[PDB]
Amino acid sequence: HIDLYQQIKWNGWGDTRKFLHQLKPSGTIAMTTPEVSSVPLPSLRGFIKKELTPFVLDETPALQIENIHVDPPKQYPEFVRELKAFFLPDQLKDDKLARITHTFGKSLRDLIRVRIGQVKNAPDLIVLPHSHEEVERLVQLAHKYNVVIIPMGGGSNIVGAIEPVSNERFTVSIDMRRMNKVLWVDRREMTACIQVGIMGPELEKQLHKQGVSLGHDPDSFEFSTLGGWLATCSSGHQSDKYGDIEDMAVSFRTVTPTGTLELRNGAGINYKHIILGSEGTLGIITEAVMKVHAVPQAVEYYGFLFPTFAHAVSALQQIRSSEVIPTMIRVYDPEETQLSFAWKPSEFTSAMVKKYLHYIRSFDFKNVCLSIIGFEGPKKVVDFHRTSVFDILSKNAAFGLGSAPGKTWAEKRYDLPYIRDFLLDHNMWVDVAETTVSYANLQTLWKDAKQTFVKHFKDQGIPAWICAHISHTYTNGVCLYFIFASKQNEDMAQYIEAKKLMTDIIFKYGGSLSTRGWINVYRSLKETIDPKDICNPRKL
Amino acid sequence: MGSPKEHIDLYQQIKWNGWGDTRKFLHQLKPSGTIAMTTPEVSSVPLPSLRGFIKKELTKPFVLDETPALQIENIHVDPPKQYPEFVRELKAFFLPDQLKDDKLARITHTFGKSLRDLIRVRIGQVKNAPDLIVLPHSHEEVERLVQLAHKYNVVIIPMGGGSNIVGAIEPVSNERFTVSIDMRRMNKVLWVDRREMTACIQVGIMGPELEKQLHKQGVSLGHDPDSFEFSTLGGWLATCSSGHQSDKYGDIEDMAVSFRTVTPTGTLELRGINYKHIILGSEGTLGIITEAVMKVHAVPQAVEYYGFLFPTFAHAVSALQQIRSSEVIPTMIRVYDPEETQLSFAWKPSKGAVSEFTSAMVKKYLHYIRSFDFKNVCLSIIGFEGPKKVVDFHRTSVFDILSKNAAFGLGSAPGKTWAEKRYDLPYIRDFLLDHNMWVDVAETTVSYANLQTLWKDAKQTFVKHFKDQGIPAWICAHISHTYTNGVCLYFIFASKQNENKDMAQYIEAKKLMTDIIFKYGGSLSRGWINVYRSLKETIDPKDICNPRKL
Ligand SMILES: Cc1cc2nc3c(=O)[nH]c(=O)nc-3n(C[C@H](O)[C@H](O)[C@H](O)COP(=O)(O)OP(=O)(O)OC[C@H]3O[C@@H](n4cnc5c(N)ncnc54)[C@H](O)[C@@H]3O)c2cc1C
Ligand SMILES: Cc1cc2nc3c(=O)[nH]c(=O)nc-3n(C[C@H](O)[C@H](O)[C@H](O)COP(=O)(O)OP(=O)(O)OC[C@H]3O[C@@H](n4cnc5c(N)ncnc54)[C@H](O)[C@@H]3O)c2cc1C
Ligand SMILES: CCCCCCCCCCCCCCCCO
Ligand SMILES: CCCCCCCCCCCCCCCCO
């Protein structure tokens, strides 16, 4: 048995066996996976050279684990004694690696910090429970002994939600990832009871064996957990079809310092909404009953090009107005489109790349935008939705790139965080900001933000690059996501300044960022459920 | 600041011992014995088949034995409590016409519309009336009222339509001075934003007035409980009521974007934890909702509602299951069992507009039951709303599935008139109660495995229980919503009042139905109590907001 904390990079993203790297001396950037070694991505180096400039990649390696200092764990003999009376020794970890991997999430600041060995407060112990009943025991003991507890799923959050902040008390990281089994599937009710430490791909694999699927698909799907999705109410990119995570949740069990809270599968409070989004501050979710659907009979994904971001946006608007909507859509601006096409290492993909070439002779590639559009469901439904959406696309100057079998279209976003580790290894950095903005303000915010970010650095003699995509649309606007990148300097101050620039410009267009009588309400809930404040204290 | 000239309040326009408009009612024409419907728009339209239906089901010459309710001036109500200092403060901010404490005001703010409520008011049994009714005109005025009630330790109970059937507005004790806050003068749409598709609405507004006001601005909400005509937005939010277009427009909780709640410890405003869910369903125990921002939609391009007959309840259930499995569903569906189908067709008026074709569909029903035994024939009403292209696709899909389950089409009728006839049902309960009869209801969600056995067993058991006592009884059912593995099943059951007039006969009928629903795993209507108690003690430290024991 290998634990997931040993399988996922402790100072980067995702599988330890998968990574980008520079082949020397050609300089060709390649991608290695467990299934294939060193596949050349010949267009990628040219892209990085063009954008962020005899081209040399300056190496800025991460510190080796042996060279990182962490203070000794605190001691609490009488509490640890009690743990060891119920838990097996392989369930308790306090080695350097276990401590580091249960300190940090996956934000830029997290990675910068671990990569230079800056480890302020690590947890004193990692516990890996195997069942709901074990969780109940651990939480009861933490409450008795006044021990801070922080539950962890994939540790993929980018908001510091798992960072230990309570150096006065013994603190325990509860790694939920050994609780990773689908307990049952009810094919009449179309529901499934799932242990919430399960990772995304494992969940969809186990469900598929019983002919069903959940369909919750954040961009972190590969390395995040059901329990994390519930505790953060994370967005999914098939939500336009399958619902939001809170709609998918039928019920779940929450272990709290004052007892276990059960939910049932009209008037009164709908109590699940107290725990959904609570980020471990109100107890630990152990098992959830989730609404599932049959594996669809048709799954069809297509690419399209538009001449401008404006055209793509108009198509987005009219699709939503039609009330006949795809399962998934994403629109990439020209910068992200170019990146997508330089992400090329298959018979169907090169055919698409030929179609892009043809298009950009007439339509300037500086302005051309890629859109990926997917449909899932019964054949009759897919056919009606596809024909509706294609009609609207044709009316908005869309150019079909055709299709390939599968969904590897929609799975390209999963690889992005791997490129982030490659930039950080070669004197570069990349961060993100996401906003909701109305249609009236979108195109000015998009153009202004991009122009402002680049010029800020250009004025200082420093290259910088920014792209954006649209993942979701609402009645009168969109969710717009910026990805922006530049060279490292010779402090944390440069990433804080760039974010400030972006945050300011986004506010300038009433883009969304993030007497309150609800504060007293939350304080009531917290003081009642967790009177000793042991559950992920001091978190926003 | 005053109510406009000639304004009369809704508590005076809705029956104080019955349902709905005081001007609308069923009545027996004399000497013919013919049952007729009067409305404020047309008087005494005969329902020539209705008397014979009641005769057949609940029985020599047939006579309706008259059992009138007591007149209002013959009802005793204990004098109201006095709180001079509290009332004098009210008069520095509220007009005399906003404050009421006469018998009519007190009775109409005591009772909802359950059978037990109607039985009690009809016999003058009024044990816990509020002491004062206040009718605020704005959010600011509710804030003032709630601040004063907290300061003076006065019980406050908000009311909308008073249509609830669970006793939710009825004062539970008389220890403290008690105020009913009638929200119904706060009845305006404040704004509509057609770009965002949202509207800000004062929640004292009644269903039809809401849809009317929104329609003027080209939009609609689409929440349609069977009590739509005489219930309020505020009440829908505070009860999480069901609506019969929810298959298209969603539940009230998802229609609610945000709202303002006036509490004894301040006003909670809405924009981690999704806080709206703390107040939704709270039944006035956590404060008063004043104004709500609701998600609305454009008035549909196409609205098409159809009737169909099936040879048996089984055929109809199969069609419903296959419809949901296909994933292409109607905006509304209702399946009526044979007994409710018969009732529907027996209620035909003898008059109609030149633009109305009920006679065409009655005739089709009569021709159909020549080939299919009427004791098994079921009516279904199926409606579609939206863009023409969407309605066309959904209708063709659904109509295909119907033809595979032996459905027989009766055709459309204009707008939602097919679905508007359910609003008339509670007027007949008043007619029954005036003529020595009673009717009650039981609603349950039941699995498909148990649906048809529960339906047959419950109907048989109920009828037999009274037939063995030599008492006539009648029972029907319909299905209003379907789920992955079950349906919402609604029973309507009726019998004679006993010559000795005791509330024990109603609790007994209810117990039989409750018992059997429970046998078949039908739904009925916890460390979370300590959570609630903490919320309550925080929001409402003096326990003035609709105090309950449990
Ligand atoms: C490359 C990348 C892409 C991303 N894409 C998206 C996206 O598309 N949409 C989106 O919303 N977010 C996205 N995120 C953010 C993050 O992945 C999601 O919020 C995810 O829900 C966190 O899941 P996790 O299992 O990794 O949680 P963790 O990071 O381990 O924990 C998150 C919070 O949940 C609490 N928690 C975890 N498990 C439990 C439990 N069982 N009981 C109680 N509390 C618990 C933790 O204490 C913490 O407060 C992205 C992040 C990255 C780095
Ligand atoms: C014939 C009939 C048919 C019905 N059909 C249905 C149906 O199809 N679906 C369904 O779900 N129910 C149905 N009901 C029940 C009832 O109509 C619903 O619960 C409706 O939501 C109640 O609305 P109301 O305005 O009449 O509320 P009221 O009865 O006036 O009050 C209900 C509760 O809400 C609280 N309240 C009211 N306004 C406010 C406010 N502004 N702020 C805070 N609290 C408030 C009250 O104190 C009370 O606790 C039916 C009832 C009848 C009699
Ligand atoms: C010079 C251009 C190179 C292309 C670099 C684009 C890399 C995109 C990396 C994505 C970053 C991971 C996101 C972390 C937070 C998620 O919301
Ligand atoms: C034999 C004829 C009986 C007449 C049929 C009466 C059916 C009318 C149902 C009215 C019930 C409406 C009020 C119920 C209270 C709760 O909702």
Coordinates of N, CA, C and O and ligand atoms in Angstrom, one line a residue, chain A residues 13 104-108 149-163 174 176-177 196-199 216-221 223-237 253-255 275 277-287 330 413-414 416-418 420 432 434 471-472 481 536 539, ligand 1:
Chain A
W13 N 2.5 19.8 -8.6 CA 1.1 19.3 -8.9 C 1.1 17.8 -9.4 O 1.9 17.4 -10.2
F104 N 0.7 22.3 3.2 CA 0.5 23.2 2.0 C -0.5 22.7 1.1 O -0.7 21.5 0.8
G105 N -1.3 23.7 0.5 CA -2.2 23.4 -0.6 C -1.4 23.6 -1.9 O -0.2 23.4 -2.0
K106 N -2.1 24.0 -2.9 CA -1.5 24.1 -4.3 C -1.6 25.5 -4.9 O -1.6 25.6 -6.1
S107 N -1.7 26.5 -4.1 CA -1.7 27.9 -4.6 C -0.2 28.2 -5.0 O 0.7 27.5 -4.7
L108 N 0.0 29.3 -5.8 CA 1.3 29.8 -6.2 C 2.2 30.0 -5.0 O 3.4 29.6 -4.9
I149 N -7.9 20.0 15.0 CA -8.0 19.1 13.9 C -8.3 19.7 12.6 O -9.2 20.6 12.4
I150 N -7.6 19.3 11.5 CA -7.8 19.9 10.2 C -8.0 18.8 9.1 O -7.0 18.0 8.8
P151 N -9.2 18.6 8.6 CA -9.3 17.5 7.6 C -8.7 17.9 6.3 O -8.7 19.1 5.9
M152 N -8.2 16.9 5.5 CA -7.6 17.2 4.3 C -8.1 16.1 3.3 O -8.2 14.9 3.6
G153 N -8.4 16.6 2.1 CA -8.7 15.7 0.9 C -7.5 15.7 0.0 O -6.4 15.2 0.4
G154 N -7.6 16.3 -1.1 CA -6.4 16.4 -2.1 C -5.4 17.4 -1.7 O -4.3 17.5 -2.2
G155 N -5.8 18.4 -0.8 CA -5.0 19.5 -0.5 C -4.7 20.4 -1.8 O -3.7 21.0 -1.9
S156 N -5.7 20.4 -2.7 CA -5.7 21.2 -3.9 C -6.2 22.6 -3.8 O -6.1 23.3 -4.7
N157 N -6.8 23.0 -2.6 CA -7.3 24.3 -2.5 C -6.1 25.4 -2.6 O -5.0 25.0 -2.4
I158 N -6.5 26.6 -3.1 CA -5.5 27.6 -3.3 C -5.7 28.8 -2.4 O -5.2 29.9 -2.6
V159 N -6.4 28.6 -1.3 CA -6.8 29.6 -0.3 C -6.2 29.5 1.1 O -6.6 30.2 2.0
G160 N -5.3 28.6 1.2 CA -4.7 28.3 2.5 C -5.6 27.6 3.5 O -5.4 27.8 4.7
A161 N -6.6 26.9 3.0 CA -7.6 26.3 3.9 C -7.1 25.2 4.8 O -7.7 25.1 5.9
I162 N -6.1 24.5 4.4 CA -5.5 23.5 5.3 C -4.3 23.9 6.2 O -3.7 23.1 6.9
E163 N -3.8 25.2 6.0 CA -2.6 25.6 6.6 C -2.8 25.7 8.2 O -3.7 26.3 8.6
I174 N -6.1 15.4 9.6 CA -6.9 14.2 9.3 C -7.0 14.0 7.7 O -7.8 14.6 7.1
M176 N -8.2 12.2 4.8 CA -9.4 11.3 4.5 C -9.2 10.3 3.4 O -10.1 9.5 3.1
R177 N -8.1 10.2 2.8 CA -7.9 9.5 1.5 C -7.8 8.0 1.5 O -7.9 7.4 0.5
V196 N -16.1 9.9 1.4 CA -15.7 11.2 0.7 C -14.2 11.5 0.5 O -13.9 12.4 -0.1
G197 N -13.4 10.6 1.1 CA -11.9 10.7 0.8 C -11.5 10.3 -0.6 O -10.4 10.4 -1.0
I198 N -12.5 9.7 -1.3 CA -12.2 9.2 -2.7 C -11.7 10.3 -3.6 O -12.3 11.4 -3.6
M199 N -10.7 10.1 -4.5 CA -10.3 11.0 -5.5 C -11.2 11.0 -6.7 O -11.8 10.0 -7.0
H216 N -19.4 15.7 -11.6 CA -18.8 16.9 -11.1 C -17.3 17.0 -11.5 O -16.5 16.1 -11.2
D217 N -17.0 18.1 -12.2 CA -15.8 18.2 -13.0 C -15.1 19.5 -12.8 O -15.1 20.3 -13.8
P218 N -14.6 19.8 -11.6 CA -13.7 21.0 -11.4 C -12.4 20.8 -12.3 O -12.2 19.7 -12.7
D219 N -11.7 21.9 -12.5 CA -10.4 21.8 -13.3 C -9.3 21.0 -12.5 O -8.4 20.4 -13.1
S220 N -9.5 20.9 -11.2 CA -8.7 20.1 -10.3 C -9.3 18.6 -10.1 O -8.8 17.9 -9.2
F221 N -10.2 18.2 -10.9 CA -10.9 16.9 -10.8 C -9.9 15.7 -10.5 O -10.2 14.9 -9.6
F223 N -7.0 15.5 -8.9 CA -6.3 15.4 -7.6 C -7.0 16.1 -6.5 O -6.4 16.7 -5.6
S224 N -8.4 16.0 -6.5 CA -9.2 16.5 -5.5 C -10.2 15.4 -5.1 O -10.4 14.4 -5.9
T225 N -10.9 15.6 -4.0 CA -11.8 14.6 -3.4 C -13.2 15.0 -3.3 O -13.5 16.3 -3.3
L226 N -14.1 14.1 -3.3 CA -15.5 14.4 -3.1 C -15.7 15.3 -1.8 O -16.5 16.2 -1.8
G227 N -15.1 14.9 -0.7 CA -15.2 15.6 0.6 C -14.8 17.0 0.5 O -15.4 17.9 1.1
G228 N -13.7 17.3 -0.2 CA -13.2 18.6 -0.5 C -14.3 19.4 -1.4 O -14.6 20.5 -1.1
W229 N -14.8 18.7 -2.4 CA -15.9 19.4 -3.2 C -17.1 19.9 -2.4 O -17.6 21.0 -2.6
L230 N -17.5 19.0 -1.5 CA -18.6 19.3 -0.6 C -18.3 20.4 0.4 O -19.1 21.3 0.6
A231 N -17.0 20.3 0.9 CA -16.6 21.3 1.9 C -16.3 22.7 1.4 O -16.3 23.7 2.1
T232 N -16.0 22.7 0.1 CA -15.7 24.0 -0.6 C -16.9 24.5 -1.6 O -16.8 25.6 -2.1
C233 N -18.0 23.7 -1.7 CA -18.9 23.9 -2.9 C -18.2 24.3 -4.2 O -18.5 25.4 -4.8
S234 N -17.3 23.5 -4.6 CA -16.5 23.8 -5.8 C -17.4 23.8 -7.1 O -18.4 23.1 -7.2
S235 N -17.0 24.6 -8.0 CA -17.7 24.6 -9.3 C -17.3 23.4 -10.2 O -16.2 22.9 -10.0
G236 N -18.2 22.9 -11.0 CA -17.9 21.9 -12.0 C -18.3 22.3 -13.3 O -19.2 23.1 -13.5
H237 N -17.6 21.8 -14.4 CA -17.8 22.4 -15.8 C -18.8 21.6 -16.6 O -18.9 21.8 -17.8
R253 N -23.1 12.5 6.3 CA -22.8 12.4 7.7 C -21.7 13.3 8.1 O -20.6 13.2 7.4
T254 N -21.8 14.0 9.2 CA -20.8 15.0 9.6 C -20.4 14.7 11.1 O -21.3 14.7 12.0
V255 N -19.2 14.4 11.3 CA -18.7 14.1 12.7 C -18.2 15.4 13.3 O -17.3 16.0 12.8
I275 N -23.5 22.8 6.5 CA -22.2 22.1 6.4 C -21.6 22.3 5.0 O -20.3 22.4 4.9
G277 N -19.8 23.9 2.1 CA -19.1 25.1 2.0 C -18.4 25.5 3.3 O -17.7 26.6 3.3
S278 N -18.4 24.7 4.4 CA -17.9 25.1 5.7 C -16.4 24.9 5.9 O -15.9 25.3 6.9
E279 N -15.7 24.3 4.9 CA -14.2 24.2 4.9 C -13.6 23.6 6.2 O -12.6 24.1 6.8
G280 N -14.3 22.6 6.7 CA -13.8 21.8 7.9 C -13.9 22.6 9.2 O -13.4 22.1 10.2
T281 N -14.5 23.7 9.2 CA -14.7 24.5 10.4 C -15.9 24.0 11.3 O -16.1 24.5 12.4
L282 N -16.7 23.1 10.8 CA -17.9 22.6 11.5 C -18.0 21.1 11.6 O -19.1 20.6 11.9
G283 N -16.9 20.4 11.4 CA -16.8 19.0 11.5 C -16.4 18.3 10.2 O -16.1 19.0 9.2
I284 N -16.3 17.0 10.3 CA -15.7 16.2 9.2 C -16.8 15.4 8.5 O -17.4 14.6 9.2
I285 N -17.0 15.6 7.2 CA -17.9 14.8 6.4 C -17.2 13.5 6.1 O -16.1 13.5 5.7
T286 N -18.0 12.4 6.3 CA -17.3 11.1 6.2 C -17.8 10.3 4.9 O -17.0 9.7 4.2
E287 N -19.2 10.3 4.8 CA -19.9 9.5 3.8 C -21.0 10.4 3.2 O -21.7 11.0 4.0
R330 N -16.5 25.9 -23.3 CA -15.4 26.8 -22.9 C -15.0 27.6 -24.1 O -14.9 27.0 -25.2
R413 N -7.4 20.9 -20.0 CA -7.3 21.7 -18.9 C -6.6 21.1 -17.7 O -6.0 21.7 -16.8
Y414 N -6.7 19.7 -17.6 CA -6.1 19.0 -16.4 C -4.6 19.1 -16.4 O -3.9 19.0 -15.4
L416 N -2.8 21.7 -17.4 CA -2.2 23.1 -17.2 C -1.3 23.3 -15.9 O -0.3 23.9 -16.1
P417 N -1.8 22.8 -14.8 CA -1.0 22.9 -13.6 C 0.4 22.2 -13.7 O 1.3 22.6 -13.0
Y418 N 0.5 21.2 -14.5 CA 1.9 20.6 -14.8 C 2.8 21.6 -15.5 O 4.0 21.7 -15.2
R420 N 2.7 24.8 -15.0 CA 3.1 25.7 -13.9 C 4.4 25.3 -13.2 O 5.2 26.1 -13.0
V432 N -3.4 33.1 -11.2 CA -4.8 33.1 -11.8 C -5.7 34.1 -11.1 O -5.4 34.4 -9.9
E434 N -10.1 34.9 -11.1 CA -11.4 34.5 -11.8 C -12.4 35.6 -11.3 O -12.3 36.0 -10.1
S471 N -15.7 29.9 -18.8 CA -16.1 28.6 -18.4 C -17.6 28.4 -18.2 O -18.1 27.2 -18.3
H472 N -18.3 29.4 -17.9 CA -19.7 29.4 -17.5 C -20.3 30.7 -17.9 O -19.6 31.8 -17.9
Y481 N -11.9 33.9 -16.5 CA -10.7 33.4 -15.8 C -9.5 33.8 -16.5 O -9.3 33.5 -17.6
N536 N -10.7 23.2 12.4 CA -10.0 24.1 11.5 C -10.1 25.6 11.9 O -10.8 26.4 11.2
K539 N -10.1 30.3 10.2 CA -10.2 30.2 8.8 C -11.4 31.1 8.3 O -12.5 31.0 8.9
Ligands
LIG1 C1 -5.1 23.5 -10.9 C2 -6.3 23.8 -10.0 C3 -7.6 23.9 -10.6 C4 -8.7 24.1 -9.8 N1 -10.0 24.2 -10.4 C5 -11.1 24.5 -9.7 C6 -12.4 24.5 -10.3 O1 -12.6 24.3 -11.5 N2 -13.5 24.8 -9.5 C7 -13.3 25.1 -8.2 O2 -14.3 25.3 -7.5 N3 -12.1 25.0 -7.6 C8 -11.0 24.7 -8.3 N4 -9.8 24.6 -7.6 C9 -9.7 24.6 -6.1 C10 -9.8 23.2 -5.4 O3 -9.3 22.2 -6.2 C11 -11.3 22.9 -5.1 O4 -11.8 23.8 -4.1 C12 -11.5 21.5 -4.4 O5 -12.9 21.5 -3.9 C13 -10.7 21.2 -3.1 O6 -10.8 19.8 -3.0 P1 -9.7 19.0 -2.1 O7 -10.1 17.6 -2.0 O8 -8.3 19.1 -2.9 O9 -9.7 19.8 -0.8 P2 -8.7 20.3 0.4 O10 -7.7 21.3 -0.3 O11 -7.9 19.1 0.9 O12 -9.6 20.9 1.5 C14 -10.3 22.1 1.1 C15 -11.1 22.5 2.3 O13 -12.1 21.4 2.6 C16 -11.9 20.9 3.9 N5 -12.2 19.5 3.8 C17 -11.6 18.6 3.0 N6 -12.2 17.4 3.2 C18 -13.1 17.5 4.2 C19 -14.0 16.6 4.8 N7 -14.2 15.3 4.4 N8 -14.9 17.2 5.8 C20 -14.9 18.5 6.1 N9 -14.0 19.4 5.5 C21 -13.2 18.9 4.5 C22 -10.4 21.2 4.2 O14 -10.2 21.4 5.5 C23 -10.3 22.6 3.5 O15 -10.8 23.6 4.4 C24 -8.6 24.4 -8.4 C25 -7.4 24.3 -7.8 C26 -6.2 24.0 -8.6 C27 -5.0 24.0 -7.8

